[PDB]
Amino acid sequence: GSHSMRYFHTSVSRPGRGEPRFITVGYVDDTLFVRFDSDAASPREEPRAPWIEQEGPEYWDRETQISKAKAQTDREDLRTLLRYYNQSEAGSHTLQNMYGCDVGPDGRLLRGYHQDAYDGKDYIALNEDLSSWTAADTAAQITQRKWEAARVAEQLRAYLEGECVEWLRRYLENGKETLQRADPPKTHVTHHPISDHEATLRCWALGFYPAEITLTWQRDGEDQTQDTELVETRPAGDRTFQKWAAVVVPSGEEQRYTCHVQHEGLPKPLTLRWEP
Amino acid sequence: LRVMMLAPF
Amino acid sequence: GVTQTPKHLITATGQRVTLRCSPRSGDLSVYWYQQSLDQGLQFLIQYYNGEERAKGNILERFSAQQFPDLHSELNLSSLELGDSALYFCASSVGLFSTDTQYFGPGTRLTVLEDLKNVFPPEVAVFEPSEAEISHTQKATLVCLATGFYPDHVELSWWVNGKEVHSGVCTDPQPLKEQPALNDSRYALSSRLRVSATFWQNPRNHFRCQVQFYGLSENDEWTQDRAKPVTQIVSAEAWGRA
Amino acid sequence: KQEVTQIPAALSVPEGENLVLNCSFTDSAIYNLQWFRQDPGKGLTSLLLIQSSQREQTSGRLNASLDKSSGRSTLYIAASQPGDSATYLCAVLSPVQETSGSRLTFGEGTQLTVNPDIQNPDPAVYQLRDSKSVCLFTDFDSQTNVSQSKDSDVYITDKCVLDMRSMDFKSNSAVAWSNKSDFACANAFNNSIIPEDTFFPS
Amino acid sequence: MIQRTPKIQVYSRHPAENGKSNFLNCYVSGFHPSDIEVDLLKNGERIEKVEHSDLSFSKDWSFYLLYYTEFTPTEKDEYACRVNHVTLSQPKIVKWDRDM
Ligand SMILES: *[C@@H]1O[C@H](CO)[C@@H](O)[C@H](O)[C@H]1NC(C)=O
Ligand SMILES: *[C@@H]1O[C@H](CO)[C@@H](O)[C@H](O)[C@H]1NC(C)=O
Ligand SMILES: *[C@@H]1O[C@H](CO)[C@@H](O)[C@H](O)[C@H]1NC(C)=O
């Protein structure tokens, strides 16, 4: 199927306490593989996946230099935005960045991403054509015009179509035993009485990868969308994910309810019942 | 692999 | 675009000079470079909005600064013979990695041990050969600038009070009159080829102008010889039928 | 540690020829590579800027490639013109040490001379007179190279192209002068290999 | 200034089994800004030596973090997660249920 590579960046200014904290992480699909934290002793880009450790020291020096330069660029970006928005130098402000590429099963570029946010809302983003910018306000239009004169999009387009795709397929091959091995969810249904005629049916999905999955409850074949409680997909802590869905059913009508699990690691969607 | 670019706001 | 002052500079050893640069309007970062014969174009220092941003293999006797109006100065102190080079100034919008730098015209610096060997040029114009007039349809005038040191010269042709560039060729660099002697004088030549009818018209006025860059009245002169200041020496000729 | 090398040092070619200018750099972590031209008198003018992730850029008759992993770049100049005569400088923007302070590193350059094709060669040696002497070797073809003198008392310049563009005419020319009492234009260019059809006016 | 309340989930890496070692997780997500205080509790006592993941965010720029620590669940002991954010008037405490 399709695959993706992503780099996330967060800069949080702490005025009066030193330089802003800079945390950046790299993801291939839903797998973390690189990280960098400015608050470390001597900060360097560090591996977080086994298939990325085989890269030489020239790889890790380059990724560390780029991480440090991104941190400095965000520092002076945060100072610049204080002038654009006429804000005080005493408050804390957040700068978020994300870029990366999506490829299909053939290994070709599906779409390129690069977008920035300031204080939780969109700031400026690279359009799908990898040539024009979308600015969220007149402050970001200042940045847009400078980036257009500096041809920033031309470097981003060349990277997203070139190095981003070439190195993504390299990561996917070196870690094919984990990045491409589907991990179907282990599923079951629990039952908890609430009163003398109301009970809960919870449908579990545990230890699956990737995180994309669908959990639906059906009564007599009818979809119970509005009557279903659904929790956010959560990480188990071992690169797998968990999720469950619950519905309140009348005591005695439990077998009329079916759970439907749709995951890419499953050959066919599962249909589960209470089954005491 | 990260991109190597300096694009100040 | 980017401008620099002065254009030329002749100085002695141990002295100090200041070079000035005004970047493009709207550019916030200025750069300084040195182009020497042995090291080529070498980066010196960069300032961004009055703040130092990057530094090359600059010597401690070199000092630079960017002012609030974004123009910049460069002090070169304790001058040595090896400081003789072209010092260029550049500027860019800011701190982008994807745009270029815009360079000024440059400041040629020449450092001598003593200024007693500075000489202005002697200029002479040679009239065309009538054998060339009969054989071809043209008439070539030749100008010679001889006996100047150093080789800070700019030769131009003026026909009827107007500087001309068509039909003009000038040697790219001067040649040394005595290559065996170390502190030798230089010589430069230039040609202006016109129509034979244009030269045979006796009202046309041809003038060869050599802009010589030398000492300044700020310097000290002792010998009875005339102080070789930055001057213009000309030689002229009129048409002959 | 970052250093740039260019080959060839110089290049003298006939006009209209496709040119190949090479550039190498030792450090691959570069923000961009650029090709400048420097004309004597004016500063530098950026011709091409290849972004970090780009592999080629194009501007008119110019076309340059980039290979970061190999540390190589080639500038291609198609249909070269006399106006392209200049020094062509290769440059890379990169950080030198562990700092975001990027610097531009330049190569030594490639001095390019594009010689025009002389339409009607009429090589001859003429003598000029001063207004109160000079020999002129002119109108020779672009194949004749003007050698220097044998005596240090005789001064001989190199070739030099002038364009009387009012009639679209170009002519090569070289000047010889001396105050030697035994100096005639018939022997002023002895050391140079001249065409046999050189007109010597008597 | 955008402010988003965190969503808290307290759970275990593997199915809870009394006597076998496991990892107690507290997952906070959907919050903004990034300043947040998350503590794991054992019978009201703050558990020391607790690791957390590196700060990342979702498509809507909302942050998410995972706090985890090794523990051995039993019938007697209670575990919970205490979270305090700029959006929370009082610190929120969520008790760990082995079937949620
Ligand atoms: C150069 O020297 C002059 C004279 O002392 C001084 O006023 C000026 O500030 C100096 N410039 C720099 C850049 O040091
Ligand atoms: C320039 O490099 C190419 C290879 O890309 C080579 O074929 C050519 O001979 C080189 N030119 C010179 C003058 O070395
Ligand atoms: C530039 O030259 C390369 C040869 O290395 C060629 O493949 C490419 O098509 C050229 N680009 C043009 C002519 O636009």
Automatic annotation (TrEMBL), chain A:
The lineage of its organism: Eukaryota, Metazoa, Chordata, Craniata, Vertebrata. GO terms for cellular component: early endosome membrane; ER to Golgi transport vesicle membrane; Golgi membrane; lumenal side of endoplasmic reticulum membrane; MHC class I protein complex; phagocytic vesicle membrane; recycling endosome membrane. It is found in: Cell membrane. Keywords: Disulfide bond, Glycoprotein, Immunity, Membrane, MHC I, Signal, Transmembrane, Transmembrane helix. The keyword Phosphoprotein does not apply. Coiled coil: none annotated. Residues 185-271 form the Ig-like domain. PANTHER family: HLA CLASS I HISTOCOMPATIBILITY ANTIGEN, B ALPHA CHAIN (PTHR16675:SF270), MHC CLASS I-RELATED (PTHR16675). It comes from Homo sapiens. This is MHC class I antigen. GO terms for biological process: antigen processing and presentation of peptide antigen via MHC class I. Disulfide bonds join 101-164, 203-259. InterPro entries: Ig-like_dom, Ig-like_dom_sf, Ig-like_fold, Ig/MHC_CS, Ig_C1-set, MHC_class-I_related, MHC_I-like_Ag-recog, MHC_I-like_Ag-recog_sf. SUPFAM superfamilies: Immunoglobulin, MHC antigen-recognition domain. Belongs to the MHC class I family. It is a single-pass membrane protein. Pfam families: C1-set (PF07654), MHC_I (PF00129). Gene3D superfamilies: Immunoglobulins (2.60.40.10), MHC class I-like antigen recognition-like (3.30.500.10).
